[PDB]
C-alpha cells in the first residue's frame, strides 16, 4: 500500500509528517526543584505524545497495521522517540539538552532529580555523536521511523503476517538511507559504514529508554493519564 514509494517520496513524506517543537512553561523566576523540573518534563512529554500519535499515522506502513499492533509499537517506542527528538534538537547546543526552546539544560540541572544525570550524560553523548557525524534531517526522520517500526515488532498466524509487512517497510527505509548517503557523494564502504554507525546508535537509544523507563515506573508529581497508560505497558 506504500511500498511503491521511491526514496525521495519516502523522505518528503517523513519530513512533512514532522511534529512541531513544543514549548515548556518555565519561567526562570521559579527557583526550580526536583518537583518543578519533573512537572515541566512531564507536561512537555505528555503534549508531545499527542503529536507523536498523529505523526505515527503518517509514517508509511503504520496505518496498514491493526489497531492492536499500532498501540503496541507506540507503547514500546514512545520514550525512544522522545529521546531521539531531544537529541536531534540539541545537536547545535553542545553540553546542553534542548527539551524546549525555553528549556535548555546542562547535566548539573539534571542532578536536580536522582538517577537522571546518568541518562543525561548518555543523551549528551548521543547528541554530540550526531553532531560529529553531521546527521541530516532526512537521515533523522528515517531513523525515527525505524525506531517506531522496530522497537516492538517481535515483542497467531496473522501476527506473523503483519511482521513481514513491517520488515518490507524497514527494508524500504534502509534503501532510502543508502539513497541519501549516495547522493551526498559518499563512497560505498562509507555508505555501509555510516549506515552501520547510525543503526548502532539505536541500540544506545533503546538502552537509555529502558533505563529511563526503569526509573519512571518507580513513581510523586502526577504523571498524565496518557503517560501513565504508556508507562503501564512496560509494567
Amino acid at each position: 500500500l506504500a511500498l511503491s514509494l521511491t526514496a525521495d517520496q519516502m523522505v518528503s513524506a517523513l519530513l512533512d509528517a514532522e511534529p512541531p517543537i513544543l514549548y515548556s512553561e518555565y519561567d526562570p523566576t521559579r527557583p526550580f526543584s526536583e518537583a518543578s523540573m519533573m512537572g515541566l518534563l512531564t507536561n512537555l512529554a505528555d503534549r508531545e505524545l499527542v503529536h507523536m500519535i498523529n505523526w505515527a499515522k503518517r509514517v508509511p506502513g503504520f496505518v496498514d497495521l491493526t489497531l492492536h499492533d499500532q498501540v503496541h509499537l507506540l507503547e514500546c517506542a514512545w520514550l525512544e522517540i522522545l529521546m531521539i527528538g531531544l537529541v536531534w534538537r540539541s545537536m547545535e547546543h553542545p553540553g546542553k539538552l534542548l527539551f524546549a526552546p525555553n528549556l535548555l539544560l546542562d547535566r548539573n540541572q539534571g542532578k536536580c532529580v536522582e538517577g537522571m544525570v546518568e541518562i543525561f550524560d548518555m543523551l549528551l553523548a548521543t547528541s554530540s555523536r550526531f553532531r560529529m557525524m553531521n546527521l541530516q534531517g532526512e537521515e533523522f526522520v528515517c531513523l525515527k521511523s525505524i525506531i517506531l517500526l522496530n522497537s516492538g515488532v517481535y515483542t497467531t498466524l496473522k501476527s506473523l503476517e503483519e511482521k513481514d509487512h513491517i520488515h518490507r517497510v524497514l527494508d524500504k527505509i534502509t534503501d532510502t538511507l543508502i539513497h541519501l548517503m549516495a547522493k551526498a557523494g559518499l563512497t560505498l564502504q562509507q555508505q555501509h559504514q555510516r549506515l552501520a554507525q547510525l543503526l548502532l546508535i539505536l541500540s544506545h537509544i533503546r538502552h537509555m529508554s529502558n533505563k529511563g523507563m526503569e526509573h519512571l515506573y518507580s513513581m510523586v508529581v502526577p504523571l498524565s493519564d496518557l503517560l501513565l497508560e504508556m508507562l503501564d505497558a512496560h509494567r
Partner: peptide
Amino acid sequence: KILHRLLQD
C-alpha cells in the same frame, strides 16, 4: 485506553 482512542482520532 486513551492511546487507543487517539489512534482512532
